[PDB]
Amino acid sequence: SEITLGRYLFERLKQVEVQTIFGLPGDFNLSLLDNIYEVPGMRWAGNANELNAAYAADGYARLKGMSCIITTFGVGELSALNGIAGSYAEHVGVLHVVGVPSVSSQAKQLLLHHTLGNGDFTVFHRMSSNISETTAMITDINTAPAEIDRCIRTTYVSQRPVYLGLPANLVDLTVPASLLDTPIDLSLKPNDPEAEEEVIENVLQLIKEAKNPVILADACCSRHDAKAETKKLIDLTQFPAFVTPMGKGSIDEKHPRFGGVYVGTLSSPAVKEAVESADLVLSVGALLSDFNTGSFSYSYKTKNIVEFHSDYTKIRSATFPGVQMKFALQKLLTKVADAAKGYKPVPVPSEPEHNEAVADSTPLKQEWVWTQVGEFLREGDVVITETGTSAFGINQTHFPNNTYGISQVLWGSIGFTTGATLGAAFAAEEIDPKKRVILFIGDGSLQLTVQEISTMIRWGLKPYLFVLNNDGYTIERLIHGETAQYNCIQNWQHLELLPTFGAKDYEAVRVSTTGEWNKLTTDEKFQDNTRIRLIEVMLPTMDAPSNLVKQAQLTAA
Amino acid sequence: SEITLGRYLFERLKQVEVQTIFGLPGDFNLSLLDNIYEVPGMRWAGNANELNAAYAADGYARLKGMSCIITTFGVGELSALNGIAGSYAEHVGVLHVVGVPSVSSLHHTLGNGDFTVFHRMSSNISETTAMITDINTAPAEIDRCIRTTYVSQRPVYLGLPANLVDLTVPASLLDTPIDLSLKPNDPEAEEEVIENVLQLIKEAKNPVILADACCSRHDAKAETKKLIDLTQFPAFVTPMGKGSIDEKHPRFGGVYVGTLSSPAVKEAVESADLVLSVGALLSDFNTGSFSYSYKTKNIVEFHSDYTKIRSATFPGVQMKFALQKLLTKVADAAKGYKPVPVPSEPEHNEAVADSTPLKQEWVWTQVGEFLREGDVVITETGTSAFGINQTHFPNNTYGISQVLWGSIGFTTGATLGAAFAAEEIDPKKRVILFIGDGSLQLTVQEISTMIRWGLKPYLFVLNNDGYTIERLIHGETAQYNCIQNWQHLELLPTFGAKDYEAVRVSTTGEWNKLTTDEKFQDNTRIRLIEVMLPTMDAPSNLVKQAQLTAATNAKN
Ligand SMILES: Cc1ncc(C[n+]2csc(CCOP(=O)(O)OP(=O)(O)O)c2C)c(N)n1
C-alpha cells in the first residue's frame, strides 16, 4: 500500500495545516507538482516570480505556523534567496523545496543540466545552507521519509527556513503510505530542571530588587506561541507592557497595563521615558537589541535585561542554553506574583484613541491617517505595513484585540509586503473567510513586487491594498538626498493595476481628503471583505508620521 | 588635487565606456551614488528592483563591453544573485558593487555573528571578490576588479564600506589607464597547438566551424570570418552565438542546437570528423527541451582563457592571438577540401490571405523581412528562443538569447540595459524583443524604467495563454503551466507612459500592415505588440523533439 515520495511530502504538509504551496514550476519539479492535485486540501498558488513567492511563503507561515515554497534548480532557488534571508532573520518557518536533476549514475544527469559551468553542482545548496536552520538533499529512498519529516519538524519547531533538495528521480519512487499514520513529532524537549530552576530564581530575585520594571514583547513572542504566557506575566505583575514594532499584536492592546510600542529613538516622549528609565526589562522573544536602521536606533539604558528566547534565556550577560521560552515562562508564572508583591502600579502612556473632527475637505496627512485607521480595524484583522513611512506610522495605531501585525522591520526588504499580503490572504481564507487582510504600502515599494497582485486576482482573494502615493521614496528622502534622482520613481496609474492584471470583480478608488477617507471606510459595504480593493491614498511629497520628522532636524546636521 | 574614492570609481567606469549605472539606492550606498551626477556623461538608471537591475546590467555589458550594478548590504545584493549567476554562466563582465557598513563594532541585517556571509555567498558566482578596508590599497584593488571584470568577462564582487567612499585620494591616478591588454602567448605552447590543429585539418575529411558566445564576447568575430573564407568549411552558430557569424556569408549553414536542429543541419554537424569551435561556453550540456554534444571527439575549443584539443587543455593559449597564427598557414593546410553545399531555412514565406491566423513557424521566417543591419535581437527562454534560430539575421545583427542559463524574466531587464547601451552607441540602432506572456510577469516592472528614460525598444509579447514550452515537455493541461491573464496593451499607459504605441496582431495580414509601415520601422517611441497565438503552437522542430524524447524509455 504505497505512494510516491512526491505524494508523501504533500500529505505531510497537509497534516501540519499547510494547504497552499508557493513557487514557480521549472525543468525539475514538474512531476512533483503533479502530486499536489492528488491531495484533497492542497493547491498551487502559481506565483508571478520566485522572490514574491518567498515573500508570500513568509507571510503564510506567520499566520499558519509554517509554509512551503518550491523552486527549480538554479534559476529558481537563487531568485528566492533574499526572501529566505529575511525569513531566516525574522525567524519564520519557510520550508524551501528545490527540485534538482537525477542523482543518476556518475551524476551524469546532474552534471549536464548544470549550466553554471564550474562543474560543482552543490553550489546552490551550499549557498542556501548559510541562511537555513538545516538542509537536506535526498539521495536515498529508504531514509527519505524520515529526512522529510525532520526537515518539516525543524521548520515548525525552530521557526527558521530549511532547504530540502528532491532529485527528480526520487519524487517518483515510492514508500509505504502506512508511514503517514504516525504524525510528525513537533513536541519540544522539556527543559533542563537544573538550568530552568536556576534561571527562574535569578529572574525572581531581579524582580524583587527592581523599583521600576517594564515588560516588552517582540517577534518570537507570537512566533513561538507565548501570547497567553506573556499576557499572564503582565496580569500577575501588573508591570507596564510594551511591544516592539515587529511583535505588534503580541499583546492585546486593550489591556490597561499596555503602554504602546517602543521604537527606540522614534518612540513618543512618554514611551521613550517609560522604557528608558526602566531598571529591569523583561524581553519576551527578543529579536536582538542595540541595533540600528538609517532612520532609528533601538536599545535600552539599563543592563538589567532578561531576554526569553525559544532556544535559551539571557540575564545580563549570562546565557542559559536549552531553557525554552514557553516552559520557562509557564514555570515563572507560579512564583512571579509573589516576587512582584511590592510593585506600585504607576499609570502608563496612551496615544489618542481618536482624531478631533475637521472639515471634510481637509487634506490627508500621515499623522492623521495613522490614527483614523484605529477606527477601521476590527478584531481578527491582519495588518501589514511596508518598511517606509508606513512601518513607523502604524506604531501609533490602536489595534483591536486578536490583531496580527506583519512589519519586516529588521531585514527591511522593500516590496516584501506585496508577497506577504498574498500569503497572509491565503492563510486567512483557510483559517476564517471573514478575516480581513489590510496592507499599507508606499507607491515606491510597490514597484519591486507589483505583479504578485495578479496572483491575488487569480484566486479571488479579497485583501485591501492601501497605496500611499507621496511621489517617491519619501523616508530615504528624510535622512539623505531630499531631491536626488535616485529617490524619484515613475508615476503609475494605481487605479488601473487590478484591471490590467485581469481583475473582473474589484474596486479601485482614490482618497485625498479627510472626508473622502471617512466616506470610504465607514461604508458598511466596503468594511466587509467582499472583493479585492485598492485605495490610492494621496499624501504630500515630504510627509511622514510626527516622531520621524522629529529626527529630520534633531539628529541630522 | 583630490577626489572621493566614490568619484574615482565612477571616473574609472567612464574611462572603460560604462555610462549607465544599475541598481537600487540603499542604507549603505547613498554616498556612493551621490558621486554619479558629478561625473558628466554618467547616469543612474533607477531600476524598479535589484534582480531586474542585474538582468539589465547583463544586457548592457553584452553590448558595451562591461557594466556596473550597485546594490546594498544583504537585501540588495541577495535580490540580484540570480542575475549575477547567469552573467557568470554565460560569461558577461558585470561589476557587482555592494555598499556595505563602515568598520562597525550590530548593524548586521541577518542574526548570526557574521558580517561576511553575503560576500561568501557571492564568491561562488564571481571571478574574484574584493572587500576594501584600507584607502591606500583601494584604488589599486578597484582597478584589478574593473580589469578582471573586462578581461575575463565574468562578474566580480566589489564591497565598498560607507566610511571609505567619502575618504579621498589623488586625481593623478586616473592619468594612467587600467591595463586592459593581454600579453602574447608563451610561443612554445602556441606553436604546439597551432601545429596539431593544422595537421588535424588536413586529416579532416569533413570539418565544420562553430561560433559560440565567447566569439563576440572576446572580440574574435573578424578572425572567425577570415578562417571561414580560407577553409570554406561549413560554418555554424550556437543559439548563444547567433549573429557572431554574419548570416549572409555563402558558407554559413544556420544554427546548430543538438537534438533540436533542422534535420539538414543536425546531419551536417553530427557527421563532421572535426569541429573548430570558436569560444564555446559549453560543449556537451542538456536542458529540459534539448541536448547538446558533437559526435566526434575530434574537437578544438578556442577560448580567451586557453586552447583545448580532444582532451588536452593548453592553459596559456589565448583565442584572439592564436587564431591569427592559424589564419596564415590554414589557407595552405585546408586546400584539399571539396566545398560541401550548406543547409538553408526558408528565406521568405508563401503568400497567403490576410485573415490567415498567426502561427509560430510563419512568424520567425517573416521577422527576417523586418530586421536590418545594426539591429539588436533579444529572445526569451520559451518558444521565442527557439523560433528565432529559423530567422535570417541581416549583417551586423547582435543577438541576446540566454539559452544556456535560461532564466525567464531575464529579457525585460536585458532589454533595458541593451537600449541604454544602444543609445550610447547610435540613436538610430533599434532594440527588438520577443518575450512570452508568462516570462514577462516575472520582470514586468522594468518597463517603467524604459518609459522613464524615454527609451524606444520594440516589445513583441507572445500571448499564447500560458507557459507553452513547458506544456510541451510535461503537463499540457496542468494548472501550474496556466497564468493569470493580463491586459498587455494596457501595460504601457498603466506604468505612466505618454509617448507610446500598443497594438494587437492576430493574423498574418495584421502583422504585415504593421511591420511594413514605414513609421513603425523607425525607433521613434516605445512600442508593445501583443502577438496572439495558439496555446500549443511552437517552432515545428521543437514540437517533434518534445514528442520523441517522451516516446523513449530513456530518462533523466
Ligand atoms: C530590496 C531593497 N532595496 C532598497 C532598499 C532601500 N530602501 C528602503 S525604504 C526605501 C523607500 C521605500 O519606498 P516607499 O514605500 O515609497 O516609501 P514612503 O514614501 O511611503 O516612505 C528604499 C529605496 C531596501 N530596503 N530594500
Ligand SMILES: Cc1ncc(C[n+]2csc(CCOP(=O)(O)OP(=O)(O)O)c2C)c(N)n1
Ligand atoms: C526564474 C525561472 N523560473 C522558472 C523557470 C522554468 N520555466 C522555464 S520556461 C517557463 C515558461 C515560459 O513562459 P512563456 O514565456 O509564455 O513561454 P512560451 O509560451 O513563449 O513558451 C518556465 C516557467 C525558469 N527557467 N526560470
Ligand SMILES: [Mg+2]
Ligand atoms: Mg512613496
Ligand SMILES: [Mg+2]
Ligand atoms: Mg507564452
